[PDB]
Amino acid sequence: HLNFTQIKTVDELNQALVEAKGKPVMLDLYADWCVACKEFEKYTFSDPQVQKALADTVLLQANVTANDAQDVALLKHLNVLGLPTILFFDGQGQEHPQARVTGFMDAETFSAHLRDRQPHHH
Ligand code: NA
Ligand code: NI
Numbered sequence: 001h002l003n004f005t006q007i008k009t010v011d012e013l014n015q016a017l018v019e020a021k022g023k024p025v026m027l028d029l030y031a032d033w034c035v036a037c038k039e040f041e042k043y044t045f046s047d048p049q050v051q052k053a054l055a056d057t058v059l060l061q062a063n064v065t066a067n068d069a070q071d072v073a074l075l076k077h078l079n080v081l082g083l084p085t086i087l088f089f090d091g092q093g094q095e096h097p098q099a100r101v102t103g104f105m106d107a108e109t110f111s112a113h114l115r116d117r118q119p120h121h122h
Contacts, residue, residue: 002045002054004028004061008076009070013034013060017093020058024120025089029075031065034083036104047107053114068077 007013007027017025030037044050064071064083074080078087081102088099099117101110 001102002043002059004053004059007060008101010074013062013074016058016060017089019095020089022091022122023058024091024117025058025060026054026078027062027087027089027095029078029080029085030061030063030082030084031067032063033065037084038121039104040084044105044107044110047111050107050114081087088117091122092109094107105116118121 005016007016010083026038037063054064062071062074064075078085079119084102087095089095096118099113101113
């Protein structure tokens with residue numbers, strides 16, 4: 001399983017971005033009842049290719065299973081319309097909306113998607 005850092009609120013995401021400044025970030029939005037989210041874990045995040053590709057990316061996760069007020073605020077703030085959604089932020093903390101993943105992707109497809117991100121080495 002990937003080693004995600006959990007965030008719950010907008011404030012928490014923003015502080016994680018501040019601390020990640022200098023490395024690219026991936027924010028995975030998850031719920032226990034989200035079938036394609038579980039499929040990401042089974043087929044894609046579990047694949048060494050993907051795991052190694054992500055090794056120099058800070059991985060964040062929001063678990064919105066409850067859909068509580070903080071979850072909803074977070075989704076609204078990110079203009080998320082459904083799950084799964086995966087956002088990508090460059091090493092300056094800027095999100096690139098075209099990089100958003102909003103459906104299941106297998107490991108080869110996801111890997112290719114990672115490759116097409118804004119360059120991120122120093
Ligand atoms: Na990008
Ligand atoms: Ni890299």
